[PDB]
Amino acid sequence: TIEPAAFVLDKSTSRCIYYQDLPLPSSREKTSIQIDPELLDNVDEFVIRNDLIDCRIDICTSHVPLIFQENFDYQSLRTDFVKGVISSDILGKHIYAYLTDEYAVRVESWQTYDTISQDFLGRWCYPLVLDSNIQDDQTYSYESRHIYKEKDVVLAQSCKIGKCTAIGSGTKIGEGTK
Amino acid sequence: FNITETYLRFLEEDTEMTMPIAAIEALVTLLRIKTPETAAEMINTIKSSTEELIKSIPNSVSLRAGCDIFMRFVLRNLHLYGDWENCKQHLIENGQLFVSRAKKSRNKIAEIGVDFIADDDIILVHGYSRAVFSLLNHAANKFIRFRCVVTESRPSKQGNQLYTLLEQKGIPVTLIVDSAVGAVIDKVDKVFVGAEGVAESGGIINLVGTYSVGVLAHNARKPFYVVTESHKFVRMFPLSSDDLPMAGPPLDFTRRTDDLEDALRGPTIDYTAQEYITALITDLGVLTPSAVSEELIKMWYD
């Protein structure tokens, strides 16, 4: 709902045509889709899409900071910037749109955070694990049935359970839980 | 210089010090009277003592094995071929030193054998061996994830005693009968068996049933285990399905009666083969497949 961007995109050059954020799945008040005619009779291979997820990762050339310095209207970086680019403020310039079949999401809200955590716990992204250990004092170990346990971790007998559980260090768990 | 008295003194004690250990200590003490240097007086006396022990023995080979081990150790001792007093002193020392070694072995076990415990795995301890119990206790202390299970064993009520001991700890306990073990095929996760003797390769002596258990495990493809400390290494191999020195008669079709006289007779002792067992548990590093046989070869050279 916060970022359901309707990306009108290219296949031959991979370049954005339109950007819009809508509150349509939550509050049906402003259901709106626009196709700008400024780059209509030059692309021809117009593809209308919406199903893409925010990452907010940018590789920037020498142009960007200078551009920022020039234009004080761009206080943001998504809604104003792409639109400006489309409009040709600095006339005739290219932007890339990298399209990957594999999953990529950025941190934004709380439900989203939860989802991210779940993904991390599962095997949804190619290698990402806690058991490998990154930060010095970490003593994490992998277990079967998608279960994560560090060292100094104890769970007691007779706990009939569903699927997927993970526990941090210094934990003492009692008996008889659903 | 007296061994029957020693035997009388130790039968149901154990706990603190292993039964075999005491015997070994006694043997050492005996040795340290008639001088190990004078091999003419000594070895014959040792042999006599062994014979006496055998005579006093009803249903065991463990003590015999221990004494053989001791003999082997003694033989190994004199290979320095220089000053003859230091060797003697060393021999004298190695008796309570053996006892000390036991603690160390236990400690080692408490470090190497604690890696096995996994997520929801039911443990069943067979027979009576102190080492296995100690291991179990150490596992409980670690609080991995387990269940301690007992049996309805029949020598002089051993299983019941074991159950009672387990009760002390607090861990929830349920029982398996000698007959009612048949239902266990995958539910109790891993089949553990305590040892009262380890022979050449896979050969282990315990109590009133192991071979059947092994067979069951094989049928089920279950992990079978032999759990012990360090004092039981024997040079032995049987021919038939089972062959051992016996005081209780095999298949004694009891004489015609009406008012009861003698009936409790059969295979009191049990052996296990090489194929049935997947893992061997000893403090001596981490050895499993056929290391004991190699050790024996190294020792005896016969």
Curated annotation (Swiss-Prot), chain A:
<comment type="function">
    <text>Acts as a catalytic component of the translation initiation factor 2B (eIF2B) complex, which catalyzes the exchange of GDP for GTP on eukaryotic initiation factor 2 (eIF2) and is regulated by phosphorylated eIF2. Its guanine nucleotide exchange factor activity is repressed when bound to eIF2 complex phosphorylated on the alpha subunit, thereby limiting the amount of methionyl-initiator methionine tRNA available to the ribosome and consequently global translation is repressed.</text>
</comment>
<comment type="subunit">
    <text>Component of the translation initiation factor 2B (eIF2B) complex which is a heterodecamer of two sets of five different subunits: alpha, beta, gamma, delta and epsilon. Subunits alpha, beta and delta comprise a regulatory subcomplex and subunits epsilon and gamma comprise a catalytic subcomplex. Within the complex, the hexameric regulatory complex resides at the center, with the two heterodimeric catalytic subcomplexes bound on opposite sides.</text>
</comment>
<comment type="similarity">
    <text>Belongs to the eIF-2B gamma/epsilon subunits family.</text>
</comment>
<protein>
    <recommendedName>
        <fullName>Translation initiation factor eIF2B subunit epsilon</fullName>
    </recommendedName>
</protein>
Swiss-Prot record, chain B:
<comment type="function">
    <text>Acts as a component of the translation initiation factor 2B (eIF2B) complex, which catalyzes the exchange of GDP for GTP on the eukaryotic initiation factor 2 (eIF2) complex gamma subunit. Its guanine nucleotide exchange factor activity is repressed when bound to eIF2 complex phosphorylated on the alpha subunit, thereby limiting the amount of methionyl-initiator methionine tRNA available to the ribosome and consequently global translation is repressed.</text>
</comment>
<dbReference type="GO" id="GO:0032045">
    <property type="term" value="C:guanyl-nucleotide exchange factor complex"/>
</dbReference>
<dbReference type="GO" id="GO:1903833">
    <property type="term" value="P:positive regulation of cellular response to amino acid starvation"/>
</dbReference>
<dbReference type="GO" id="GO:0006446">
    <property type="term" value="P:regulation of translational initiation"/>
</dbReference>
<keyword id="KW-0007">Acetylation</keyword>
<dbReference type="GO" id="GO:0030234">
    <property type="term" value="F:enzyme regulator activity"/>
</dbReference>
<comment type="similarity">
    <text>Belongs to the eIF-2B alpha/beta/delta subunits family.</text>
</comment>
<dbReference type="InterPro" id="IPR037171">
    <property type="entry name" value="NagB/RpiA_transferase-like"/>
</dbReference>
<dbReference type="InterPro" id="IPR042529">
    <property type="entry name" value="IF_2B-like_C"/>
</dbReference>
<keyword id="KW-0678">Repressor</keyword>
<comment type="subunit">
    <text>Component of the translation initiation factor 2B (eIF2B) complex which is a heterodecamer of two sets of five different subunits: alpha, beta, gamma, delta and epsilon. Subunits alpha, beta and delta comprise a regulatory subcomplex and subunits epsilon and gamma comprise a catalytic subcomplex. Within the complex, the hexameric regulatory complex resides at the center, with the two heterodimeric catalytic subcomplexes bound on opposite sides.</text>
</comment>
<dbReference type="InterPro" id="IPR051501">
    <property type="entry name" value="eIF2B_alpha/beta/delta"/>
</dbReference>
<keyword id="KW-0597">Phosphoprotein</keyword>
<dbReference type="GO" id="GO:0006413">
    <property type="term" value="P:translational initiation"/>
</dbReference>
<dbReference type="InterPro" id="IPR000649">
    <property type="entry name" value="IF-2B-related"/>
</dbReference>
<keyword id="KW-0396">Initiation factor</keyword>
<dbReference type="GO" id="GO:1900036">
    <property type="term" value="P:positive regulation of cellular response to heat"/>
</dbReference>
<dbReference type="GO" id="GO:0005851">
    <property type="term" value="C:eukaryotic translation initiation factor 2B complex"/>
</dbReference>
<dbReference type="GO" id="GO:0002183">
    <property type="term" value="P:cytoplasmic translational initiation"/>
</dbReference>
<dbReference type="InterPro" id="IPR042528">
    <property type="entry name" value="elF-2B_alpha_N"/>
</dbReference>
<dbReference type="Pfam" id="PF01008">
    <property type="entry name" value="IF-2B"/>
</dbReference>
<feature type="modified residue" description="Phosphothreonine">
    <location>
        <position position="288"/>
    </location>
</feature>
